[PDB]
């Protein structure tokens, strides 16, 4: 188990407004093309390994960006995962219905948080807290990301209905 | 008997399913097969980046273009010259 | 890290030494057969086939020492240790 | 456009290196998973040699794969899988052999495998009783035996002798 040319890596691919399993990769290749190779093995355009974001998660920890693992471009898959491949899960994010088109009950806290994140680019919290069904101390929690920080099914459903309408006016 | 610059590939696009042959350049890179199939089929560049692509030899289990060969410099002639007529490229658009 | 497959590192002698994925839910007593299939060997070669198993740096033991339970999944015996073991399949 | 009869051709190559190529006919409705033994039997090989046999299937110039990649259906026939594709695939069979001279498909006999047969016979036979039995002359059995560089045995004779040898023994 290393020896060998391959290393098993458990992968999960995603995109959100089974599919989760080991793929053998080249222990000898570059840690920084791991997302690419994993995705190719799965059948993904070369260019689909571009709109792709990677989060690596140890046992039941919060996952972190592959940035945290190492900052040496020259490290390999083996250098880094030889020892942990049995406990790590690679989380690939592929970055298409529109938010306004999402029906209010399909709305989740993650999509509310995404919706809010876009809006705040070109708006203010107090103003946004004004006719969206959220409060200001509610809206800070969700964007802060901590910890938690939770929107009930009722508010999620209402924020989403409001969002659909707000977007077409 | 295809000594052209091109080779035809039968394509199915999933998501209502769009099928058609497409002529692919033999000098182009095998792993670029999905991009080219898509462009050449009447889709965007952005469409490629949002697409999973498997190749199917007869009635066999479809497989990623990487099961086929581990040589990145592999031309479309290299891999498809002998089998283009028995292979279906099925593509998915998310 | 719990899907339908487990990575098993297999060395076949008589080289061929590498990881092969196998169905967790399969029967531990079909581990040779099914590992052999995934490499090319026929339904016939598995088995005239002798299997030992080596945990870390120990001597390797026959696969019988691992268990008697005929209803033992591969998961059962290997979900916990697949990463420290080596399956050695000899063909007579 | 062939659509019936009970048989199907299967191009097989067989290493053991003595690379031997040849189409063979196999029972269309047999099981795909016993292809490697069916091909070997149908090629003139004993059941013994099929027990060390590694078999990889190859389409065109692609990476060769185990028969388990092609399919998962444990009841898929040779017809299901290769009916439409028999003319672009090769069954690459590797044996740990060589087979006993008698188990060597007679089409694969050369002047040197004929020589080894003669030797093994002359260990307990006469030049004349051999020359009586086998399809060579005494003159040629002199030629083959007393000269290592003697290769002037026709293909037709090699096969003939090889069939004769297979018999008895």
From Swiss-Prot, chain A:
TM region(s), chain numbering: none
Tissue specificity field: Expressed in the subventricular zone, rostral migratory stream and in the olfactory bulb (at protein level). Mainly expressed in thymus, spleen, and lymph nodes with a lower level observed in the brain.
UniProt superkingdom: Eukaryota
PTM: Sumoylated. Sumoylation promotes cleavage by caspases. Phosphorylated by PKC. Acetylated by PCAF. Phosphorylated form interacts with HDAC1, but unphosphorylated form interacts with PCAF. DNA binding properties are activated by phosphorylation and inactivated by acetylation. In opposition, gene expression is down-regulated by phosphorylation but up-regulated by acetylation.
Subcellular location(s) of the protein: Nucleus; Nucleus, PML body
Summary of the function given for this chain in its UniProt record: Required for the switching of fetal globin species, and beta- and gamma-globin genes regulation during erythroid differentiation. Plays a role in chromatin organization and nuclear architecture during apoptosis. Crucial silencing factor contributing to the initiation of X inactivation mediated by Xist RNA that occurs during embryogenesis and in lymphoma. Binds to DNA at special AT-rich sequences, the consensus SATB1-binding sequence (CSBS), at nuclear matrix- or scaffold-associated regions. Thought to recognize the sugar-phosphate structure of double-stranded DNA.
Record text on subunit structure and interactions: Interacts with PCAF. Interacts with sumoylated PML and HDAC1 Tat via the CMP domain. Also interacts with DYNLT3 and POLR2J2. Binds to EP300. Homodimer. Part of the nuclear protein complex gamma-globin promoter and enhancer binding factor (gamma-PE) composed at least of SATB1 and HOXB2. Interaction with CtBP1 when not acetylated stabilizes attachment to DNA and promotes transcription repression. Interacts with CUX1 (via DNA-binding domains); the interaction inhibits the attachment of both proteins to DNA.
Family the UniProt entry places it in: Belongs to the CUT homeobox family.
Protein name per its UniProtKB record: DNA-binding protein SATB1
Gene name per UniProt: Satb1
Included range, full protein: 71 to 246 of 764
